[PDB]
Each structure stands twice: as structure tokens, then as C-alpha cells.
């Protein structure tokens, strides 16, 4: 009989629903394939190779394999190991008298512990739950990869557009600063013209560099995640506003969304493992029995080996039970119980963190949308203001400074739009990941 306590799931005090659920889509995030979630064909292609070559995933998938093997050897302790032990012995007197030789060549199993009280059985169950938890950690490593490779690609495309944004503002100032010298001469506060002229163009250059630099940092971080230098045959990609298929993931009930999270099911298996370790410590109060056996030829001389009459066998069953261990037996159980008491608060820590991981992602997608829409219409307005003054200068103006200031306000309000355009895209990848999504590639029946 085994002595492992029944598994009762811990009561994590947490809200039953999220105060930010607005979606109605049937398709769950976990159910949704990432290939049907991420839009950019370039990004879709990148994941397929990274999912095949990523070191962290390769490592995480190997560790789960050795935990399977470590389990398979622990289950083998329930079976007798057969060994062919051939040994010899020899005594003799120092003074120069007599000697004695005994040669035993035989086969036999040494101390098979008959697990009557599920001590080896429970300790083998720990190896299984240890493996089961590692598999879930392998899944968590799978989801963390797709989220990371996506957010690192969004940082690239942002910088791509950040360069081009500062590229054409260097081109639109190019046609104006030469025009500000061929234009009809203005006032003497024209001195307030080359200073912002320089201020616009030389900030635009500093921006292009920062963009071009962060572009490479995203480019290089991508080559690491795919274990390969970036290939050539790739579609030019889509802008940040076209990085996701039109869909917002639902997160129904908190109990529902907990089941999909790998890091959560990894916490219950690591707990079930600690339960098994109790069944091993609780069986220590019980007697342990061990069986020794052997066959073969016993002899005094090598010549007599394997000759008729020398055949012997053995059977030595030895059992034992501790009567007073000075509380050590009680103590080792207490440890096994505390080791398990820590796995329920680790399970609680896992849930409370997992809930927060989602509630933030929901609050972000809501507010990174409202904040983005504001910064976008601001860009449109500042762009419109630029065009109006763009005609004023074309006709009769008292200052290119007006037009020039309008260029910078339109440039700054547009760069601030790209900033929120990325932050919204990044969180979208986190929302998918933290919702358990990214498991399968394609959504199917």
C-alpha cells in the first residue's frame, strides 16, 4: 500500500473575473494559433525557424527528456538488478607458515528492497511529477519564445519607420533651408529662424542615428533568437498597424484562464511531487525489508570451479524497524510536510502573479489604445496645420519660422505616434502569451 495523500487543489484567494474583459470572440487565445494571430508574413516566417533553432527552447526541451530518463531509472528500483560477481580471497601467515584461498564465482542480486509500503513507489512518483512539471516548464519556455521574438521584431520595424520618418523630414527641410535663403528677405528677428532651422535638422539627424542604432540592436537580437544570421528571401513586412490580425482575445473566468497557463500546471505538479515525498517519509515509520540471493560455484581452488558438486545458492532476507530515532523519523516527515507546505504557497505565488500578468495586459490594451488614438489625431491635426501654413509661406508670409516651427510640431507629434504604436503592439504580444496563447501554430478543429 502507498501512503501519498490525495491531491486537494489550494484555495487561491483571487477575483473570479477581470474588470477589463470586453471581447466576445469564441476563439480563446490558447486555442488561437499564433500563425492566425500574427499578421506579418515576415514575422510568421521568422518564428518557424526560431521555434526550430532557439537555444533556450532546445535546452528546455532537453531538460524534460532527462527528467523522463531520471524517472525511468527510479521506477527500476522496484526490480531486482542481476550481477555476475566473481571474486577471490586469500589469507596467509607472515612468519612463513600456512595460507588459505577461497574462490567464489557466481551470479546473484544484491539487496533488492521489497517496497511493501510504497517508499520506492512514492519516491518514483516524485520523479514522475518532477518530469511532468519540467514538461510544463518546457511549454512556458515555448510561449516565452514567441512573445520575445515578436516584441523584438516590432522594435525593428519601429526603428525602420523611425528612420524613414526622420529621413523625409531631412528631405522636407532640405528643400526649405535652401529656399529660406532664396526667399525674399525678412525682418531682423529672422535671427530666430536659423536657430530653429538648425534645431530641427540636427535633431532629425540625432533621431535617425538613434533609430538606426536601435534598429541594429533589434536586428542582432533577432539573429540570436533564431540561432542564425538573418536570411534574404523575406517579404518586406508590414507596418506596426498591420502586425496583428483583427481580433481581441477573451479571458472569460479567472478559474478558466488559470488552466491554460503552463507555469500554473507546473506549480501543481511540483506540488504533487512534494506530496509523493511525504509518502516516502511517512513510510519510514514502517519496517524496510531487503532480499539477497546468489548462485554459482564455491571452491578452494580455481580448478574445482564449475566442476560437479561445487554448485551453491543463497537466500538472505533481512528486515529491520527503527524503534527510537531520537525524533529523527518525526523530523524527516516534518521536513517533507514543510517542503510540501512551501509548494502550495509557491502555487499561490504562481497564481497571484499569473493573474496580475493578465490583468495588466488587459488594462494596457485598453489604455494603450485610448492613449494611441489621442496621439494619432494630434499628429493629423499638426500635419494639417503644417499644410495650411505650407500654403501661407507659398504665397505671402512674414516668417518661414512659422512654417519651420510647423514642420517640427508635425514631426514630433508623428514620432510620438509611432512610440505609442509600438507600445500597443508589444503589449498585444504579451496579452496573447500571458493568456496561454502561442501553443499551436494554426487554429484548427
Amino acid at each position: 500500500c502507498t501512503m501519498i495523500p490525495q491531491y486537494e487543489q489550494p484555495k487561491v484567494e483571487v477575483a473570479e473575473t477581470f474588470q477589463n474583459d470586453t471581447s466576445v470572440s469564441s476563439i480563446r487565445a490558447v486555442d488561437l494559433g499564433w500563425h492566425d494571430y500574427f499578421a506579418d508574413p515576415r514575422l510568421q516566417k521568422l518564428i518557424d525557424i526560431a521555434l526550430e533553432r532557439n537555444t533556450s527552447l532546445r535546452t528546455a526541451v532537453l531538460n524534460s527528456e532527462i527528467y523522463r530518463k531520471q524517472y525511468m531509472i527510479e521506477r527500476n528500483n522496484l526490480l531486482p538488478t542481476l550481477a555476475a560477481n566473481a571474486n577471490g580471497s586469500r589469507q596467509g601467515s607472515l612468519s612463513g607458515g600456512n595460507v588459505s584461498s577461497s574462490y567464489n564465482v557466481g551470479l546473484g542480486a544484491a539487496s533488492y528492497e521489497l517496497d511493501l509500503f510504497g517508499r520506492v513507489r512514492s519516491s518514483s512518483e516524485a520523479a514522475l511529477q518532477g518530469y511532468f512539471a519540467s514538461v510544463a516548464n518546457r511549454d512556458a519556455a515555448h510561449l516565452s519564445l514567441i512573445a520575445t521574438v515578436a516584441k523584438a521584431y516590432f522594435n525593428e520595424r519601429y526603428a525602420e519607420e523611425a528612420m524613414s520618418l526622420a529621413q523625409r523630414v531631412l528631405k522636407t527641410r532640405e528643400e526649405t533651408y535652401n529656399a529660406v535663403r532664396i526667399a525674399v528677405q525678412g525682418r531682423r528677428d529672422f535671427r530666430r529662424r536659423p536657430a530653429p532651422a538648425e534645431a530641427l535638422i540636427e535633431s532629425a539627424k540625432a533621431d535617425y542615428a538613434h533609430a538606426a542604432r536601435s534598429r541594429e540592436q533589434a536586428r542582432n537580437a533577432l539573429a540570436t533568437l533564431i540561432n542564425r544570421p538573418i536570411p534574404e528571401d523575406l517579404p518586406a513586412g508590414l507596418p506596426l498597424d498591420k502586425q496583428f490580425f483583427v481580433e481581441k482575445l477573451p479571458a472569460g473566468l479567472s478559474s478558466e484562464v488559470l488552466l491554460d497557463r503552463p507555469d500554473i500546471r507546473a506549480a501543481e505538479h511540483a506540488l504533487k511531487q512534494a506530496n509523493a515525498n511525504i509518502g516516502a517519509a511517512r513510510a519510514a515509520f514502517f519496517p524496510s525489508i531487503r532480499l539477497t540471493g546468489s548462485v554459482g560455484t564455491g571452491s578452494v581452488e580455481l580448478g574445482g570451479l564449475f566442476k560437479s558438486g561445487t554448485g551453491v545458492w543463497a537466500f538472505a532476507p533481512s528486515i529491520t524497524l527503527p524503534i527510537f530515532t531520537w525524533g529523527t523519523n518525526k523530523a524527516n516527515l516534518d521536513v517533507a510536510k514543510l517542503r510540501q507546505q512551501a509548494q502550495i504557497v509557491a502555487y499561490e505565488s504562481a497564481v497571484q502573479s499569473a493573474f496580475q500578468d493578465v490583468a495588466n495586459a488587459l488594462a494596457a490594451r485598453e489604455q494603450l489604445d485610448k492613449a494611441y488614438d489621442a496621439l494619432s489625431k494630434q499628429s493629423r491635426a499638426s500635419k494639417e496645420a503644417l499644410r495650411l501654413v505650407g500654403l501661407r509661406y507659398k504665397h505671402g508670409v512674414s516668417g518661414a519660422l512659422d512654417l519651420l516651427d510647423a514642420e517640427r510640431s508635425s514631426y514630433s507629434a508623428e514620432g510620438a505616434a509611432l512610440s505609442a504604436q509600438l507600445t500597443r503592439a508589444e503589449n498585444l504580444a504579451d496579452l496573447y502569451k500571458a493568456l496561454g496563447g502561442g501553443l499551436k501554430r494554426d487554429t484548427q478543429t
Copy 2:
């Protein structure tokens, strides 16, 4: 006799005083209870539940309990373990001749190592200092919790006021943008009015969102630290300028402030542990002695068991001393000495980091006060400028742009005041924590 070297505290080269001590209060930070340090009744309430339910603290307090148990079992190696070992044996010839059976059912202790040279004693001392250090780490986990839950609450209240700040600037622009159209018609650089009009209102909306989003992130991080969704029956709280009772903590002498730090006393116990491991390795040059004993009934047949005459006893004291170990004995000691040589530089690393942890907190509270006072009077000035122009527009003005620009300068200079109002509050919680404060709830006799 034991062979553990006497504990001499390492000489950490560090300044004796801090160049930022300005306080004169008798009440030490460590002596000061956090309930008498933190002002907000809402925050005071939050800590009491988090201190009872936090996972990280629950884990840290469990680990110190298993280190007590792991110690209790190591002290038990100084006592003989009694076991009732009943065993049987049986030999026999293969050809079909004779057999032999010997059944021994008895009681006895197996190999009690009489620790004459404090080898088990020292190795048991390591288990104690290991436990003593874990207790100090449990205290460091206690202090880190209060500091974290406080700084996470300040981030909430900041966002609460950040929303309301942008809320009324949306309300004050509301009454002006409708008024800027019903006002008497202005010039043609009125075109320089709706652009900043849009720029003010649409930045205020982007601010409210960022504030409302970071509000939830602080709200969610709070629900994690308390292992519970946030309750309802709570006082509305106090503003950031009312988060601390009027008091600045003193940090007298560097030697003085080192003693209160848990992470420091944890470094000396982890060192004392390494000292104990030397007393075990240094006793390896000495002979180890072991005692075997047993009583019970020896027999050839089960029937004879527990029948008169079968009573036997045993006493096998076996001692041994290594003569030449090929330097392995010297090597294992060298390791034990190096393992201890690393605990003094870990102690040094602990102190040099602990000193920096305080010196920064002192330099910050000084400069986050001077920088805050400047940003605050700037807000007052910009607010005053707004009111003056607020009357100009009310009478005879040539531009709502003046008034409108004054709104944004007053809004920006006020939001920059809240930013420094939080950073000053956060560091205040760190100063208390890094000074050893936060141990007891209430300051007492």
C-alpha cells in the same frame, strides 16, 4: 575536544560616518515601528494583511523552519540509533545435497560514530549557523516586503492624482475651447490657436490613459503582494505629501548601522558556518571510531527462537586512522579553508553593498527634497502666471493663445511636481528599509 577556530570579525575597509547625516532624532529607524513611520491609514492597513499573507515571506519563514529541522537531525548523529533487525539466511547445494539455515532475530545499534574530535559536533554546528543565517534572511525578506508594498502603493496614489490632474485640465480646457469660438474674433495668427488647443487637450488625454493604466498596474501588483484581491472597507487614503509621519531617520556611525542590517548578520553566520566546516575537515587527520552492538536470539531453526539458551550479544568497537591519503586529507582541509575564505569576502561584499545602500538613500533624500522644492515653487509661479493671464483674457486680450499656453505651462509644471513628489516618497521607504527599519510594527519601550 572540538577544532573550530575562534570567530574574528573581518576588517571591512569603509568610512566610519556618512557625509549626509543631518537628523538628530533619538529614535533609530530600526527602533521605529513602521506603523509609526508610514502615515496613510490605508497603507498601514494594507501592510498588516500583506505581512500575514505574502507568499515570499511565507516561503522565507518556511525555509528557516526546515533549517531548524535539518539541524535537529544533525545533532541526533551524536546519539545511537536503535533498530530491531530480524534477518534470516539460507545456503544449499545445487546438485541436490545439503542445505544450511541460520535465523537471527535481534536488536542493536549499527556503527555509532563516537565523535571524540568534534567532527559530528562541528558538522552539526554548520547546520545551526546555516539555520541562524536563514533566520536573518527571513528578516531581510520581511523588510523587503514592507518597502516593496509601500513603494507600490505610492505608485498607485501618484497615478490617482495624475488622473485627476489631467481630469481638471480637461475640464478647464473644456470651458475655454467652447469659449474660444464664442469669443470675439481675433487675428489671422489665430491659426496658432487651435493647434496648441488640440496639443493641450490631446496630450492631457494621453496622460490620463498612461496614468489610468499605470494605476491598474500598481493596483494589480498590490493584489499580488497581499495574496488577495483588494477589499472595500478602506479609508480613501492621503496624498503623497502625507504618506510619512514628520520624521527623518538618523544613521549615526557606520559600525552602528551595520549591526541592524539582517543581510549583514546573515553574512557572519554563513561565515561561522564555514568555520564549523573547518572543524570537521581538521578532525579528518584524526582517527574515527565506531561502535557496533546487538542482542537477541541466534538460531538454526525458527522454533528455537526466543527459547532458553539462544540469547546472544555483541560489541564490536572498530577504529581507523588514515596514514597516507596522497594529499587528499590536506586538500579537503584546503577546500574547507577556501570555502571560508570566500565567506569573508562575501561578508565584505555584503558590507560594501550595505553601506552603499544607505549612503545613496541619504544623498537621495537630501537631493530629492531640494529638487522637489524647486519644481514645486515653479508650479506655483506658473499657476500664478496662469491666473494673471486668466484675468487678461477675461477683459481685453489679443490672443487666447496666451491664456491657453499658460494653461499648459501650469499643467506641465504641476505634473513635473508630482513626478518628484513620488520619487521623494519612494526613497523615503528605502531609507527606512535600508536603515534596518520595518522590523516591529509599533515603536515601544
Copy 3:
């Protein structure tokens, strides 16, 4: 014979060259001594003491020493351990009959495992490669120190100049705000003068504090890295533009630059270690042989000990071979192979990260130079604009606001130049470090 597989270096798919190599210098970064790389005599002095006293380096250099010792004891398993075991035994009847005593005092080696199949040899090789890898990690800890202490010093000097920058802008506003009241009375939009007047001076004060605070944080972090409070006898140092000797490091071929990196050679030794662990598991299919021997005096009474005729000796060679282990033998090898399969993907992860570590440092030094040059000429232009208006106000002006606005634009454009002046300097220290540089102090023959 040993059974450790030959070492074949993994094929890391990575670009052969960097798309940012522009230097032509023969002197490699690794070949270049840091004393000939870092310019500031104050910084050069600081490293020499930190390299002697840093805790993290002291720890890293100790761990490599214990790995040498742990190896030396594993090599000793190939040699017999001699022990002088003197033991006694005693049986007796409970009823009150007969007793029996046997006293054996002798010398002998217990179970020397004759390693015929390189099982101990291979397991000892793992201890060597484990040590070899720790040495490389000790080098990586050496390089990480110089990089860290340099970047922490640049942050200090930045703040030093940041304070002085805001110090003289408080001095130049000092002579103007008293002059703005003694100047001839201006218009009624003079109201648009004290608001930016306050805005300039009160931002300059907030800047000085932030600078003075971050100055101490860099000052304190420096005292930690050198395990000592900062001394006095030190040259005042050089500005950020004078922190490096005029030289840009070359990074020829990717294969070339991989060899200098300590973290890379640490990954191959940790791999070679896993190779050795296979030679131990692959030898488990083979029989293990063990030799027991002893000499000394056997007796029934203590008096007979060491008296003629009692001299006995022993020689018990015992060998054994597992026939069926239920796949456990195959499993333990599979683990040893998977443990090694993980060290090649850890080697791949090491390389892909090491390449990125350099490619970013190259792209940064290129773009942090172009972005810096732009922000610098912007400062010159804004400074020039200030002087021109500085003469306008000196003669006939309609607003100190013009001059006052010119002060802030010149102040802000100069502080933004120092910001890029530091970021460029920091990356320069990382480029040197990530290129394997910082090993030797002085570049030599």
C-alpha cells in the same frame, strides 16, 4: 583504455564578418592593455586598486582554486588509500554461559577500484574541465570588472560636469535677473518674462540636484567596487571627451573574435566536461574490479597482539559485471549524452549571444558618434545664437525674453550634448570588454 569521445567543435551558424568593421589598427582589443586604452590617470589608478580588492573578482578567483583542489582529490581515486584499522569484537551468551573475543589490529587498503576502463579517469577529467571552465569564468569576471568600474566612473564625471553646467547657468541668470529689473522698462508682455525667468533658474536648480545626487550614487558605487572608501591623492581627472586614448578597436573575423572571449572558451570546457561524463557512463557496461588487502596481527587476546605467529595478511580481489539492469545502464548513458547535447546548445547560445554582444557594440560606436556630432554642433549653434542676442540686449532690445530664451536653448542643447557624450563613452568601454580586451594592464611585445 579510456572511452571519452574526441572533441569536435560545434558548428555555430553565424556570419563570418561584422557589417560595422571600420578600424584598421593592428593592435587587437584583447592584445591592447587597458592602461593603454583608458586615458584618465584617475581612472587608471582606480582600476589598479579595484583589481586588487574587488569582492566579485576575489570570489571568482577563489572558486577556480577550489575546482583545482576538487580535481586533485578526484585524481587521487586512481591511487590506493592506506588506513591503519584496529578493531575488536566480542560475543557472549545472555543466560550466563560463554563469551568469545577476537581482536584484530592491522593495516590495509579497502576496495581500491582498479580503473581498467577509464571510469575514474574520465570522471577525473570532468573535474579538470570543470576547473578549466571555472578559470575562464574567472577571466570573464576580470573583464566584467574593468568594464563596470569604467562605466561607473564615466557616470561620476558626467554628473561632475552636469553640476558645473547648471552651476554657471545659475551664475549667468544671476547677472541677468537682477539686470532685468534695473533695465529700462519694457512692454506689458513683460509678463512673459518672469515666468520663463523662473522656468530657467528653477529647472537649473532641479538639474543640479539630480546631477549632484547621481554624482553620489556613482561615487558610492565606486567605493563598493574597490572595497574601500575613495582616497584623496588623485589627479582631478579628465573630461568625458578625454577618457579614451585615440584608437578604435578592430574585430576582424567572427571566428577570430570568438577565441578571445573567456565566456566562449568556458563553454567548450564545460562541453569537454560533459564529454568526460560520457566516458564514465559508457564504461558502466563494463565490469568493475576492486581490490582489498590487509596485514597485521590477528588474535583472541590483547596480550597475543604483536607477538610471533600472529602475523596475517589478506588479498581479496572482487570483480562484477551487470547482466540485465532493466535498461538503467542504457538510461544513464542516455542522460550522459543528453547532458552533453545540452552543452553544445549552451555553446551555441554562448556564441550567438557573444556575437550580438559585439555587433551591437560596433553599431553603437558608429551611431553614438554620428548622433553626438549632431547634438554638439547644435550646442555650438545655440551658443552662437545666444552671444548674438547677448549683444542685442546689450544695446537696444525689445525683450530680455529673447536673450533669456536664448540662454535656455543654449543650456538645454549643451546638456543634451553631455548626455550623448556619456553614452558614447560607456559603449566604448563595452566595446573593449566585449572584444576580449582588458586582460593585461599594459600592451607589450
